[PDB]
Structures are given as C-alpha cells and as structure tokens.
Short mmCIF file of C-alpha atoms and ligand atoms in Angstrom, two decimals:
data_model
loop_
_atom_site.label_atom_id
_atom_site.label_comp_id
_atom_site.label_asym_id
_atom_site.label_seq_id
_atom_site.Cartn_x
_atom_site.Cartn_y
_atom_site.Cartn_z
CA UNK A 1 -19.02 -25.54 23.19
CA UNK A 2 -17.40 -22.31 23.47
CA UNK A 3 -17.78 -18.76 25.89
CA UNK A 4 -15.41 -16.61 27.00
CA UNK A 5 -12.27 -14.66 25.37
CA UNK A 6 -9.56 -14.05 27.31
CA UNK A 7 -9.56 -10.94 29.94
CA UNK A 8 -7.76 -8.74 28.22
CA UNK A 9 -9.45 -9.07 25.13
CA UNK A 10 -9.71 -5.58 23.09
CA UNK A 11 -13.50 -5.33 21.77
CA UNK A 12 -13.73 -2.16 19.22
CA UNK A 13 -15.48 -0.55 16.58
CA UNK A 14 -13.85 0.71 13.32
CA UNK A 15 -13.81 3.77 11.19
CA UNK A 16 -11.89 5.95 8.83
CA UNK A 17 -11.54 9.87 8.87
CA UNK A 18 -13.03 10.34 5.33
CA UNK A 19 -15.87 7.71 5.81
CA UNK A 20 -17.47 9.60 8.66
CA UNK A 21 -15.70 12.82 9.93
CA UNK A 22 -17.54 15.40 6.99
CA UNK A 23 -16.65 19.23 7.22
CA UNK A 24 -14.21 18.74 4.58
CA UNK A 25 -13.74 23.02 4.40
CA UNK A 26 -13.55 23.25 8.56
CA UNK A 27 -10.41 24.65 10.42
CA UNK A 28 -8.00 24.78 7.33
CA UNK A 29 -8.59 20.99 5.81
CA UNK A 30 -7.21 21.07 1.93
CA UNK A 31 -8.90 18.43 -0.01
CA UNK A 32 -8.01 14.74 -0.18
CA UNK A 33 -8.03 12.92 -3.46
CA UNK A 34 -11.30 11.18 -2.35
CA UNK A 35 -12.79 14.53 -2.12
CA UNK A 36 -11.18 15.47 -5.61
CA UNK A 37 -12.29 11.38 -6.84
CA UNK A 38 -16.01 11.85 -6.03
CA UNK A 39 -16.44 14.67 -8.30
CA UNK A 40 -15.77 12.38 -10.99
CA UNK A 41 -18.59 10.70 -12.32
CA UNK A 42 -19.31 7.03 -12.20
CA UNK A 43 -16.95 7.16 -9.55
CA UNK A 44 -19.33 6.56 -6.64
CA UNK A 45 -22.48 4.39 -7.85
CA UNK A 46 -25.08 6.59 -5.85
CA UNK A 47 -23.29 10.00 -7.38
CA UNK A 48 -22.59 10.89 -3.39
CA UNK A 49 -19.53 12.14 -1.48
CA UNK A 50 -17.74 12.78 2.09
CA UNK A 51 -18.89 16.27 2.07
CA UNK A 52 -20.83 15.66 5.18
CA UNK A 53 -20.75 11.99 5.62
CA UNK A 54 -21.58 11.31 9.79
CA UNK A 55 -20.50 15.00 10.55
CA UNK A 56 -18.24 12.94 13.26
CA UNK A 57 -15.96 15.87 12.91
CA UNK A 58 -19.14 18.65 14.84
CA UNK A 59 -20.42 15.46 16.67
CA UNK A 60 -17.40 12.94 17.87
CA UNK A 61 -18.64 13.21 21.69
CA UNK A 62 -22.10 11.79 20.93
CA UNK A 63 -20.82 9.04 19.03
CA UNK A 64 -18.26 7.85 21.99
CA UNK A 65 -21.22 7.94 24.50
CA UNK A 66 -22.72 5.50 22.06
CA UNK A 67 -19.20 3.44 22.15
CA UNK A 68 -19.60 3.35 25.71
CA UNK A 69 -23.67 2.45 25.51
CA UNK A 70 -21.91 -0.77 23.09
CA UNK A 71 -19.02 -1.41 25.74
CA UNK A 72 -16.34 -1.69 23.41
CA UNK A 73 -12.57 -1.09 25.62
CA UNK A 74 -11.32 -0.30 22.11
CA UNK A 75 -12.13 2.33 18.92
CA UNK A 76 -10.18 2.26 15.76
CA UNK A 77 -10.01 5.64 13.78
CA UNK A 78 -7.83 7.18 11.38
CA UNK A 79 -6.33 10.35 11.14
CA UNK A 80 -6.75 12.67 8.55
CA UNK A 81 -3.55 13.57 6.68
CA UNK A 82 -5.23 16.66 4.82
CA UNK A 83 -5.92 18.52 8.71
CA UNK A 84 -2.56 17.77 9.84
CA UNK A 85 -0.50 18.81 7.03
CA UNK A 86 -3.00 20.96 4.48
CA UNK A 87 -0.14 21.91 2.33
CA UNK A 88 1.07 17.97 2.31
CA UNK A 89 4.09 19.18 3.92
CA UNK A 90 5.66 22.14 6.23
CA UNK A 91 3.19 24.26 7.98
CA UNK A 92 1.39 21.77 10.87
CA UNK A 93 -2.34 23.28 10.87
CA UNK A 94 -3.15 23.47 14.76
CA UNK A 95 -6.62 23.12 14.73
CA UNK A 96 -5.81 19.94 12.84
CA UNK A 97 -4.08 18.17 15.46
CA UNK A 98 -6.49 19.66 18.57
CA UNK A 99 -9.20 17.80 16.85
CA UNK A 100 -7.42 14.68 17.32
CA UNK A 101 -5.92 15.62 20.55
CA UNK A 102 -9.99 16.24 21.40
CA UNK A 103 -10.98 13.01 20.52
CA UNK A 104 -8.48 11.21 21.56
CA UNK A 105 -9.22 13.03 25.32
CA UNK A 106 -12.74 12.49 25.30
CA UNK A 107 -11.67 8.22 24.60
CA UNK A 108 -9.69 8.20 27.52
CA UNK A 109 -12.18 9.56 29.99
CA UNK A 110 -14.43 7.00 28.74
CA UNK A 111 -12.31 4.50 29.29
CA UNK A 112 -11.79 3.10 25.54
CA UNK A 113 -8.20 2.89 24.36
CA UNK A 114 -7.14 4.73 20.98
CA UNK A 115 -6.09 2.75 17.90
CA UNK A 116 -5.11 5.36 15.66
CA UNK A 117 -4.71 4.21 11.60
CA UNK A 118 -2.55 6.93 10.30
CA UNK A 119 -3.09 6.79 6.51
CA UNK A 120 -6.68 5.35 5.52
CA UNK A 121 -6.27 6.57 2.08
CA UNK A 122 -7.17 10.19 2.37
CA UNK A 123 -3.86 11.56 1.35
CA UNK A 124 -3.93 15.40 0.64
CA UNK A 125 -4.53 16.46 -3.04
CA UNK A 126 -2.05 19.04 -3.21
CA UNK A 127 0.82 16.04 -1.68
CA UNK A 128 -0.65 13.79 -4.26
CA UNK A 129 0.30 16.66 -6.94
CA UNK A 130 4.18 15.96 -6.12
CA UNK A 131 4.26 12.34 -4.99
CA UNK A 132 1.59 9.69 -6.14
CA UNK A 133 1.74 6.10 -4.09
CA UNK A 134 3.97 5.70 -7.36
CA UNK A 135 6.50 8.14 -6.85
CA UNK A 136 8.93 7.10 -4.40
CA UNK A 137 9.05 10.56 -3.04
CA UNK A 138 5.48 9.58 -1.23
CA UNK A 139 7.85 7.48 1.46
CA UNK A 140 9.48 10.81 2.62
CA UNK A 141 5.58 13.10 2.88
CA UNK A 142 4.30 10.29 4.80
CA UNK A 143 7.38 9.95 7.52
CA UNK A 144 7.01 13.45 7.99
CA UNK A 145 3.12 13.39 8.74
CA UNK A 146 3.83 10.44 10.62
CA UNK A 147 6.51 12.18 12.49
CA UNK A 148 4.46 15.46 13.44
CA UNK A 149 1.03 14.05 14.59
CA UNK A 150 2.97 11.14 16.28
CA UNK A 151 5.55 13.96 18.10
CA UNK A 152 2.04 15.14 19.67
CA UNK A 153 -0.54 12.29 20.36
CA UNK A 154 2.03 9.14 21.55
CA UNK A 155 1.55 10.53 25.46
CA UNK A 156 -1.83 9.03 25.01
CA UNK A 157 -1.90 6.67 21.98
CA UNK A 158 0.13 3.33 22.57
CA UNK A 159 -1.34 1.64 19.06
CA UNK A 160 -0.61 2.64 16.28
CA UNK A 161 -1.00 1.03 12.63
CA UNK A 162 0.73 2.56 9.67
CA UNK A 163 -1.42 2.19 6.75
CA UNK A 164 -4.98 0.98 5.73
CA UNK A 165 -4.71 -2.20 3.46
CA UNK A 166 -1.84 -1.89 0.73
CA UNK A 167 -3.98 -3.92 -1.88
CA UNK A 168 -6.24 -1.23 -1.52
CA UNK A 169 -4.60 1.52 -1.41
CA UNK A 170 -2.13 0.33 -4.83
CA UNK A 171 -4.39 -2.24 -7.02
CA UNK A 172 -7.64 -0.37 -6.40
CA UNK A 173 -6.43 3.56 -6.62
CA UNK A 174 -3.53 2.38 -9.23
CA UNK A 175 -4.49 -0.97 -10.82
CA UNK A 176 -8.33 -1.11 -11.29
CA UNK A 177 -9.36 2.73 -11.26
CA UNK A 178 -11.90 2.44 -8.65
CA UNK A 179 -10.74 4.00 -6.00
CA UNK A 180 -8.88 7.85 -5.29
CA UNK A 181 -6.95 8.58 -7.55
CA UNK A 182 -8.60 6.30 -10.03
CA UNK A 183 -5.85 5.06 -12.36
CA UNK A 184 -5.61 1.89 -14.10
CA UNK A 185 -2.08 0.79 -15.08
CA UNK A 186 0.19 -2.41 -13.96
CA UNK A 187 3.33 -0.47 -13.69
CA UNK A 188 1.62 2.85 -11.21
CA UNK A 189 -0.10 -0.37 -9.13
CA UNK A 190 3.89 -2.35 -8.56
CA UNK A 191 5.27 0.97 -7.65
CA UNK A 192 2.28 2.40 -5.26
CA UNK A 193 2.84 -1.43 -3.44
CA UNK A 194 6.30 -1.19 -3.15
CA UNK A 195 6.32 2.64 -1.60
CA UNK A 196 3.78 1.70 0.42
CA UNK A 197 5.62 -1.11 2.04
CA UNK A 198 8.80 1.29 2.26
CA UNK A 199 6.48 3.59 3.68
CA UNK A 200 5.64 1.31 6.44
CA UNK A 201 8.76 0.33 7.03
CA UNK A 202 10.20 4.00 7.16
CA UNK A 203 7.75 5.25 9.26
CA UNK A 204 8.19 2.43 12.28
CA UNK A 205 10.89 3.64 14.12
CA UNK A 206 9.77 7.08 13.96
CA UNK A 207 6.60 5.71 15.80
CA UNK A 208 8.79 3.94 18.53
CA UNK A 209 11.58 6.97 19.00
CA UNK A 210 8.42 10.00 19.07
CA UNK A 211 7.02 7.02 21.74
CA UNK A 212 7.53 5.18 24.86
CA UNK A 213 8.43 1.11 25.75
CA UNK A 214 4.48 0.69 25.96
CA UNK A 215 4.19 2.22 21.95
CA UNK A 216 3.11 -0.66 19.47
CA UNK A 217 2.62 -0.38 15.81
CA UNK A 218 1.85 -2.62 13.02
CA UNK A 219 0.75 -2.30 9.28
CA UNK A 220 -3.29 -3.41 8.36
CA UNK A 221 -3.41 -6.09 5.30
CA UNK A 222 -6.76 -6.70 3.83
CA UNK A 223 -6.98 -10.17 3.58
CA UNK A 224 -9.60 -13.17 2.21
CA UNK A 225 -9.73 -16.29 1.91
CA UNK A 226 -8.97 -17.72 -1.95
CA UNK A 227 -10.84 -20.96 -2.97
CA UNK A 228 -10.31 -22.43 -6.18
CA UNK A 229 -13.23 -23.60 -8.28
CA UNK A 230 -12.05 -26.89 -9.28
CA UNK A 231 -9.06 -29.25 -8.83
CA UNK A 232 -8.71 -28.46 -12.65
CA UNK A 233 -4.59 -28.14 -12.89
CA UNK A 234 -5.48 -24.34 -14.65
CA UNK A 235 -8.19 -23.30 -11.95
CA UNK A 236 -5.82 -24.46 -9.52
CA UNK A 237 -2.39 -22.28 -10.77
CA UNK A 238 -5.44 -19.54 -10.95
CA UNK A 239 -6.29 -19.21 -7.21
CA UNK A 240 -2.55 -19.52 -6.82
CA UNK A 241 -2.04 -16.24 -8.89
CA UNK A 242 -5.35 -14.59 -6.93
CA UNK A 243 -3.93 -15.89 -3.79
CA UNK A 244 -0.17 -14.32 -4.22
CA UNK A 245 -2.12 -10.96 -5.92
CA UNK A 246 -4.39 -10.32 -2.48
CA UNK A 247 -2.84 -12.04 0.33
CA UNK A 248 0.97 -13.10 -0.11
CA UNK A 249 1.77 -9.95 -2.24
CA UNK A 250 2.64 -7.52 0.94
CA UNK A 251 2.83 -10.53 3.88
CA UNK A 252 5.52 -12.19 1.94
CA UNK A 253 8.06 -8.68 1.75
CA UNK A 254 7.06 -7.97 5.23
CA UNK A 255 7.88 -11.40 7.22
CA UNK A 256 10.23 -13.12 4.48
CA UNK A 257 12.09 -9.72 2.53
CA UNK A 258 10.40 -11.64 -0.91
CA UNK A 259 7.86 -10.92 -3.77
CA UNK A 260 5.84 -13.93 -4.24
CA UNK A 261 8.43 -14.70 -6.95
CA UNK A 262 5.86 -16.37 -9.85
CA UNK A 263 3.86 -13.76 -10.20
CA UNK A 264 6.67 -11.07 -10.05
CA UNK A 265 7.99 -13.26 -12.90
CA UNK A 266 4.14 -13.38 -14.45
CA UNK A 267 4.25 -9.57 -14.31
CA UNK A 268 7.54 -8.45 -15.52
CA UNK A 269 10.06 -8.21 -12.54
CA UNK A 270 11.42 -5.35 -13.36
CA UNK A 271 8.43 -3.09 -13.01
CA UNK A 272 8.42 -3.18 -8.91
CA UNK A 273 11.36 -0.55 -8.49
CA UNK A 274 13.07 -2.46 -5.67
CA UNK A 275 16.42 -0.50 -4.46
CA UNK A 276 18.94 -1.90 -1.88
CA UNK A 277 18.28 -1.76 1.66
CA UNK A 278 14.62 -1.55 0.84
CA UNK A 279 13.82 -5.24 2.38
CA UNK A 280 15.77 -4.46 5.43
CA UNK A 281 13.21 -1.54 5.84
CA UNK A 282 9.98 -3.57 4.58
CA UNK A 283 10.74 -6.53 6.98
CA UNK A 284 11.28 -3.48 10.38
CA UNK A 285 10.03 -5.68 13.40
CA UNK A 286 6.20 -4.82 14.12
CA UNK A 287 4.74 -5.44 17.05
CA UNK A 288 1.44 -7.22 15.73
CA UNK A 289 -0.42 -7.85 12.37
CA UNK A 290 -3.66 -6.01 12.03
CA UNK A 291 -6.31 -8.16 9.25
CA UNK A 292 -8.87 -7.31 7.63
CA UNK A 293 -11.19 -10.17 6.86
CA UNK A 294 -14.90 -10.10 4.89
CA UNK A 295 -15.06 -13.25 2.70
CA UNK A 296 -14.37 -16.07 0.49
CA UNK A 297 -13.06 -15.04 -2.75
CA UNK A 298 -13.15 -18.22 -5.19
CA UNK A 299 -10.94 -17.92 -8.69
CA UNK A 300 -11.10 -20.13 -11.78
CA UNK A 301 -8.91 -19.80 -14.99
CA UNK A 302 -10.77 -16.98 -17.16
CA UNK A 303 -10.01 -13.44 -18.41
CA UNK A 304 -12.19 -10.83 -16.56
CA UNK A 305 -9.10 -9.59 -14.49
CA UNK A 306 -7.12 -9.69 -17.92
CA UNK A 307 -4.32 -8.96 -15.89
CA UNK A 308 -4.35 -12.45 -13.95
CA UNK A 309 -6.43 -14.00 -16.11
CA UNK A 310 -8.74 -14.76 -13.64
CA UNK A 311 -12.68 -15.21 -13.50
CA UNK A 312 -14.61 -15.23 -10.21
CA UNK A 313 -17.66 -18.30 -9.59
CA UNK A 314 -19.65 -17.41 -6.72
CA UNK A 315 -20.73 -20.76 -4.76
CA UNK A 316 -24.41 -21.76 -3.39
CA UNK A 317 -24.12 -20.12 -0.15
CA UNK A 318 -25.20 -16.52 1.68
CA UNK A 319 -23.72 -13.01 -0.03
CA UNK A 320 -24.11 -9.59 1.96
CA UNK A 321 -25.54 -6.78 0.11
CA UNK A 322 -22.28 -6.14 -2.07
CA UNK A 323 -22.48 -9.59 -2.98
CA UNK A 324 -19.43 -10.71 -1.06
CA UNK A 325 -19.82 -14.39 0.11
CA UNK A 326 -20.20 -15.08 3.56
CA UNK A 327 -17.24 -17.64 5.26
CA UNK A 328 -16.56 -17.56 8.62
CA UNK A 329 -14.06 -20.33 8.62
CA UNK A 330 -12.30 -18.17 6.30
CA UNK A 331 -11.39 -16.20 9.38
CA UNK A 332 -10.50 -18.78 11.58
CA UNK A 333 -8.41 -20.00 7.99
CA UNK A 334 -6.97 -16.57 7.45
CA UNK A 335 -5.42 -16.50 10.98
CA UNK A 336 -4.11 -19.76 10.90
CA UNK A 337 -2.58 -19.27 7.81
CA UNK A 338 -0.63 -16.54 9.61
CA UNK A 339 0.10 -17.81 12.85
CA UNK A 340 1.81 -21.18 11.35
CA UNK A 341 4.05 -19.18 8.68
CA UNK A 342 4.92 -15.61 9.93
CA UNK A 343 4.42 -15.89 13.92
CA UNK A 344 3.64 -12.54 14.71
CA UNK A 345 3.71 -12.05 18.31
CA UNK A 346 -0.20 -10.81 18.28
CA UNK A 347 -2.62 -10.76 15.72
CA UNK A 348 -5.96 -8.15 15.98
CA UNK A 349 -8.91 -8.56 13.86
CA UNK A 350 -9.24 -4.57 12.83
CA UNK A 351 -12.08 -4.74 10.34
CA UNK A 352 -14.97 -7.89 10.06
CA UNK A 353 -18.47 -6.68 8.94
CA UNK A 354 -21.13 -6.89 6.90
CA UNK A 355 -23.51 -4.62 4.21
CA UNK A 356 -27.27 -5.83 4.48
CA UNK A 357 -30.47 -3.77 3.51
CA UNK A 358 -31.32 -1.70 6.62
CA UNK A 359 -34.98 0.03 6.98
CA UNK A 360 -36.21 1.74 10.18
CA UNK A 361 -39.17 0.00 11.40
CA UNK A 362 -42.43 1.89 12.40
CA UNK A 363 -41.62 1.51 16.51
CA UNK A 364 -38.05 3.17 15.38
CA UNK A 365 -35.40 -0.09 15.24
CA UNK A 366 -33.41 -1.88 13.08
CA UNK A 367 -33.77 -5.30 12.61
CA UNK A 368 -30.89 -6.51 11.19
CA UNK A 369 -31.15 -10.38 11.79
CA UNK A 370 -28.40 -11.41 8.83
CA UNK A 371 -26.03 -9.08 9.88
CA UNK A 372 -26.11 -10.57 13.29
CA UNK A 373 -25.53 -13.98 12.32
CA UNK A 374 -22.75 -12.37 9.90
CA UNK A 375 -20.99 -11.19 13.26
CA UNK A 376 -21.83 -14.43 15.48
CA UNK A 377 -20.44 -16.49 13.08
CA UNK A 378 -16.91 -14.75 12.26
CA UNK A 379 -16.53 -13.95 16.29
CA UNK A 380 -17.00 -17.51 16.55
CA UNK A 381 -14.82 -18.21 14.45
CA UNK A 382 -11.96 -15.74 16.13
CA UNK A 383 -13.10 -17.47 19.66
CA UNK A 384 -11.64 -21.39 17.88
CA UNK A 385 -8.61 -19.08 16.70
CA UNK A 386 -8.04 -18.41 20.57
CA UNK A 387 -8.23 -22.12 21.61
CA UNK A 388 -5.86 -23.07 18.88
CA UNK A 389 -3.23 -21.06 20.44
CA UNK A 390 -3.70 -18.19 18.22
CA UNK A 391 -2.28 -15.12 19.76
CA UNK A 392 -6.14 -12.92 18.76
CA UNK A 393 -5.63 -9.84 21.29
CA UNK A 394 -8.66 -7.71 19.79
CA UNK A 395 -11.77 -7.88 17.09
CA UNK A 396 -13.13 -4.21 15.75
CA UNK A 397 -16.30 -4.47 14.14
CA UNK A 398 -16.35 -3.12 10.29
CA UNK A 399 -18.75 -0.40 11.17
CA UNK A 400 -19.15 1.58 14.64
CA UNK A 401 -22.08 3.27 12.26
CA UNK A 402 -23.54 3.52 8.38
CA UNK A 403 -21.09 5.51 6.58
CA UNK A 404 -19.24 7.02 3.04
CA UNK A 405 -18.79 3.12 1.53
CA UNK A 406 -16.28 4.55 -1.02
CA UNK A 407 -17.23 3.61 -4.35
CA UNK A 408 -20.99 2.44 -3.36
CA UNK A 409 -21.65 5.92 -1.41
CA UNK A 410 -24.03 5.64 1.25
CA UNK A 411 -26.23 3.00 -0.43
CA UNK A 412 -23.81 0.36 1.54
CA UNK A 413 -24.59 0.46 5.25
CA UNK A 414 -21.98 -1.64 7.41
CA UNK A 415 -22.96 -0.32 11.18
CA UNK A 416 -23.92 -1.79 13.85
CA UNK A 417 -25.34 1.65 14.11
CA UNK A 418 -27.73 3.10 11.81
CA UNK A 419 -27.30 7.12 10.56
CA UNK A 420 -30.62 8.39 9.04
CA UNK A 421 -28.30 11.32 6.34
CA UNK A 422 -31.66 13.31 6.80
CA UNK A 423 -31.28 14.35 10.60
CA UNK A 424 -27.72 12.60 12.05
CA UNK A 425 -29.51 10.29 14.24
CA UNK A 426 -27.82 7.43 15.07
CA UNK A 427 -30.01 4.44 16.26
CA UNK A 428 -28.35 0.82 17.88
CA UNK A 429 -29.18 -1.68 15.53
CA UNK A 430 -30.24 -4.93 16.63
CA UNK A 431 -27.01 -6.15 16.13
CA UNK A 432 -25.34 -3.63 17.80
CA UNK A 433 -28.04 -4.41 21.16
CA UNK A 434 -26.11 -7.96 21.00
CA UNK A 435 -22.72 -6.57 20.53
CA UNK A 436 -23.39 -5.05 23.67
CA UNK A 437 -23.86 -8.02 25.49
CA UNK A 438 -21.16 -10.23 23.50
CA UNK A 439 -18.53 -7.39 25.15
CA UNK A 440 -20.16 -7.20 28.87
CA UNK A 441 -19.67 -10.76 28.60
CA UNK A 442 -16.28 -10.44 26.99
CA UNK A 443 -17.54 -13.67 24.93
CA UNK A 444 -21.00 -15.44 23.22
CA UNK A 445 -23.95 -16.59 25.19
O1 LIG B 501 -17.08 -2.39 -3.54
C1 LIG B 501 -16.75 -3.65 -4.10
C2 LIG B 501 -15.21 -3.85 -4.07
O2 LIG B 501 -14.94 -5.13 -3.45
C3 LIG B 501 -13.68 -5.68 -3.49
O3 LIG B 501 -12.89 -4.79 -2.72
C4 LIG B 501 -12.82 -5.00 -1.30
C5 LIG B 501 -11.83 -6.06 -0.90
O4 LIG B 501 -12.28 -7.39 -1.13
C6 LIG B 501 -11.65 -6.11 0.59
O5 LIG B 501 -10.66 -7.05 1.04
C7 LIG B 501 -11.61 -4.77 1.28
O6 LIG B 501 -10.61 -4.51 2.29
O7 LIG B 501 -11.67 -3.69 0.46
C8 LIG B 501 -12.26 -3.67 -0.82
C9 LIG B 501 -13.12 -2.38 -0.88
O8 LIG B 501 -14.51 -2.68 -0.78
C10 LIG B 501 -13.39 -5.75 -5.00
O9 LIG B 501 -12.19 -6.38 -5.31
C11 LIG B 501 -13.38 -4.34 -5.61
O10 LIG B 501 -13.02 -4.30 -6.99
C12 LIG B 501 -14.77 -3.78 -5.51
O11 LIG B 501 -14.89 -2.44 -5.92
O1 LIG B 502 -15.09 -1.86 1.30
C1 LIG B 502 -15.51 -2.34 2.57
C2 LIG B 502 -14.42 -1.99 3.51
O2 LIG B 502 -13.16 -2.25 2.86
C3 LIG B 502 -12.00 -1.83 3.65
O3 LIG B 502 -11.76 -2.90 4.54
C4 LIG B 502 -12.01 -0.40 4.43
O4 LIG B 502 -11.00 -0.14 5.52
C5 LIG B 502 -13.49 0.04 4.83
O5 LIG B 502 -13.50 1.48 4.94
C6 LIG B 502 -14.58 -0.51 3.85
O6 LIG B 502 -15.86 -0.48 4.38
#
C-alpha cells in the first residue's frame, strides 16, 4: 500500500534541556523551577530529579554520533533559559550560550539540521520570583531571552519554535499542580494561557528581525484526539468541553483571534485578562504548526476534573506504560483536523512516542517489540496524512533516549535509546535499529 515520504522529509529525534542535559550547578546555571519542583515531595512518583539526568550537557558529542548511527537529517532540543540568562534577566552568562553554540556546531558537521525549542518549561527560579506564566510581566523576560540567544545562534539555526505545549505549561504547572511550579487554581491556569500565547506572539518577529529570509518559527501545541463515550446528549457536550480545554483552547486564538467562546463562558470570561491589541499579537503569521500527538483521550459526563466535570473511560484496546491509549488514526485525525480549518502552510510532527517496560537482555539489547509497532503505526499514519495532501514536512520521535519523564522520574522510558542511570551507556533499542532503516529509506518497508 504505502512507501516512501517525500525527499525532503525531516526525520528527527526529540528532547528537552531539563529532561537530559544534568549538571544543573555547571558554568553559572541558576536553578529552574523544575529543579526547585522536584524537591517537593510527591512531586515526582519515583522521588528522582534532573540533577544528572543523561549528563547530555558533559556528553552531547556521543549522543549526535548516535543521531547519525539512527540517520535522522533532523534533532529537536531546547534551550535552557536558566544558562542563558541565570539572573532571569540582564547579565547573558557566556558559557551559557557556547554550550549551545557547541552543540549546535557539532549538528552541522554531522549533517543534522537544528530545531531549537526555546522555552520547554525550565524557566529560571529567580525570573519565576518576579513574573509567574500568570503575571503578564513573563511576556517581556521571555522576549528578552528570546532576543539574546536568538541575536547569537540564527547564523546557524533556521527553525525555531517558541514554546513547548501551552496546555502544559498553564493547566498542568497552574491548573492541576503537577507540574513546576505546582499550583492548582482556575484563575493562575487562564492567565499563564493567555501570557503564553502573548508570549508567542511577542517573541515572533524578534525571531525573524535577529534572522534571515530562510528563519522559520512556529509555536508547539500538545494535541490528542477527544472521543466521547457515548452519543448520550451529556457525554457528548462533555468531550466538547475536553475537546475546547486541550485542543481548541490555544489553536482557536492563534488562527481565528477567539477563545473557544462556551467554555470561556463555562469558566467565567472575565478571568482570561485579555487587553487590546493582544489578538493581533496571538494570531502573528507563523511559518508552520509544530504537534504533539500520543493518544486517544475519551471523556464522558462525570466529576473527576471538577473543573469540567469530566470523567475519563478507557476503551478495550492497547495502553503504553503510563496508561495512555494507543490510536494511530488519531494522528492522521489530529492533522486533518488542522489542515481543513487553520491551513498552515506546513505542519511537523515534533513529539510521537511511546513509554513501555524496557529490560536489558543477557546478550546486551533491548527488545522493545510494542514500542515498535507504537511507532509503525503513527508513521503510518503521518505517511496517509502525506497522500491526503497534508503539507507533513518532518516527524521527531518522542525520545532520542530514556530520560527525566517529569512527574514519573526515570521510571518512564520513551527512547528509542536506552540509558542504563548506573554507567551513561546508551544502547539502540530495537526500535531504534528499525528507525534506522525507516530514515535510510526515507519511508516503511
Ligand atoms: O504523566 C501523566 C500525565 O499525562 C497527561 O499529560 C500529558 C498530555 O496528555 C500530553 O498531551 C503531553 O504533551 O503532556 C502531558 C505530560 O505527560 C495527563 O493529563 C496529566 O495529568 C498526567 O500527569
Ligand atoms: O509527558 C510525555 C511527554 O509530554 C510532552 O509532550 C513533553 O514535551 C515531553 O518532554 C514528555 O515526555
């Protein structure tokens, strides 16, 4: 039925600065609220933290000869706000940016273009201090990190994505408590959305003026795809809520200058502290939409989200390791969805992955059969996108390697790459043995 992507295709591997990076002390690095987070307990469920992590930050040159050993053309990282900026703001810390400057050298002489994610939720402690996602101050701290480490890297890095996943980074840290900082209030979680939309918005044509007519930037939405449980009137309006909570709440300001206007209504309109002009900035042209895409997500009318009044059923069917069911055709849904309604000019798949129980065997592999199918299915899936007209330029695997998984520690292991923490070694996975082939062959055998 269906080989090969299209020539250009961009094949990567994803990670963030906190998740693998470690030396959290080295070359003047203040804390980030994840390291301040961790130290909290119940936090992370395996009482673990970034300390050390992949110790990608000592190592990065090993782990790009293993990029090239997987044939990617493409690596997604972030950059680390806390080196850049250790104060937040002011003094540029030098050793910060050669880092970056280092790694981004040693990707180019391999051959495998940069796709730097500027904020991936690590903002500086000391920044957080003065401006929370809440405080509309934050806008400001970030266009000025975004301004200095763009000023020095652009000569080299063409993409560029603005921030990591605004559901994240505002429901989770704001809304739910389980991520840095770990609050849990509707009002913080409106406000960290909206400033982090502004601070998209704010921040794009400082990427394009600090670049060149070959710069492109984008924001990163997390994104799944909502099922509802019944065609029960009440399950029904449910998804509907889910749906405008995770997927229409930041797509909608960004192509169509709107709040999904229900729920804003549902939640009290007047606690998203919307100012003029601020749509004009939200809706800035981008050059692409960046998704992130893991599962199915299916809603029924309930109160464990007491907030949405939502509960979640889980249907007969295959669930990774954090019990997240696994979907495919939500992909190929998810980008669909997209392509008929906002028509962004190109479309990358920046995180897809999966959490399974890894074990070294006795000959020294990893057999990971489940996440293979996990990755055959969803690239698959992207490959129908393509034939459908779908304007797919790239897929980067959710993980280059095992790493920090946030609030599950290192108990959740997303590589294609395994990391025994013991000794740093980093062993191919099975999976990551056929990813090698899938981009040599630039499609599916
Ligand atoms: O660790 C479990 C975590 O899962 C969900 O959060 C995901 C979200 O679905 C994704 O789209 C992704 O980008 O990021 C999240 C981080 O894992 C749950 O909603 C969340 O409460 C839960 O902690
Ligand atoms: O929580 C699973 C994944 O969620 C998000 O997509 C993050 O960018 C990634 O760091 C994490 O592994």
């Amino acid at each position: 039925e269906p080989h090969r992507f299209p020539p250009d295709f961009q094949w990567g591997v994803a990670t963030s600065s906190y998740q693998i990076e470690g030396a959290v002390e080295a070359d003047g690095r203040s804390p980030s609220i994840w390291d301040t987070f961790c130290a909290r307990p119940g936090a992370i469920a395996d009482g673990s933290t970034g300390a050390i992590a992949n110790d990608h930050y000592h190592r990065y040159r090993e782990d790009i000869a293993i990029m090239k050993q997987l044939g990617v053309n493409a690596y997604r990282f972030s950059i680390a706000w806390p080196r850049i900026l250790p104060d937040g703001r002011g003094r540029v810390n030098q050793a910060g940016v050669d880092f970056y400057e280092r790694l981004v050298d040693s990707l180019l002489e391999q051959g495998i273009e940069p796709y730097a994610t500027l904020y991936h939720w690590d903002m500086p402690q000391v920044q957080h201090d003065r401006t929370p996602w809440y405080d509309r101050g934050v806008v400001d701290a970030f266009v000025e990190y975004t301004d200095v480490i763009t000023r020095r890297l652009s000569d080299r890095v063409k993409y560029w994505m603005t921030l990591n996943e605004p559901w994240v980074i505002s429901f989770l840290g704001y809304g739910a408590g389980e991520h840095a900082p770990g609050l849990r209030d509707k009002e913080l979680y409106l406000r960290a959305a909206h400033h982090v939309l502004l601070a998209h918005g704010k921040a794009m044509p400082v990427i394009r003026a600090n670049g060149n007519a070959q710069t492109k930037a984008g924001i990163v939405l997390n994104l799944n795809w909502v099922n509802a449980a019944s065609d029960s009137p009440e399950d029904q309006a449910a998804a509907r809520r889910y749906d405008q909570f995770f997927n229409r709440w930041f797509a909608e300001p960004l192509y169509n200058g709107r709040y999904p206007e229900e729920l804003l209504e549902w939640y009290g309109r007047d606690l998203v502290p919307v100012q003029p002009g601020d749509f004009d900035i939200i809706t800035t042209p981008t050059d692409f939409l960046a998704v992130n895409y893991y599962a199915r997500t299916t809603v029924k009318a309930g109160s464990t989200d007491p907030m949405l009044q939502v509960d979640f059923v889980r249907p007969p069917g295959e669930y990774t390791a954090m019990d997240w069911e696994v979907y495919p055709q939500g992909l190929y849904n998810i980008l669909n969805w997209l392509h008929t309604d906002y028509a962004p000019p190109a479309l990358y798949v920046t995180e897809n992955g999966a959490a399974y129980d890894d074990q070294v065997s006795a000959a020294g592999e990893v057999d990971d059969p489940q996440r293979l199918a996990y990755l055959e299915g969803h690239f698959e899936a992207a490959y129908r996108a393509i034939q459908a007209g779908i304007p797919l330029k790239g897929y980067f695997v959710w993980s280059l390697m095992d790493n920090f998984e946030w609030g599950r520690g290192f108990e959740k292991r997303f590589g294609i790459v395994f990391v025994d923490y013991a000794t740093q070694q980093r062993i191919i996975k099975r999976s990551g043995k056929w990813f090698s082939q899938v981009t040599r062959a630039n499609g599916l055998p």
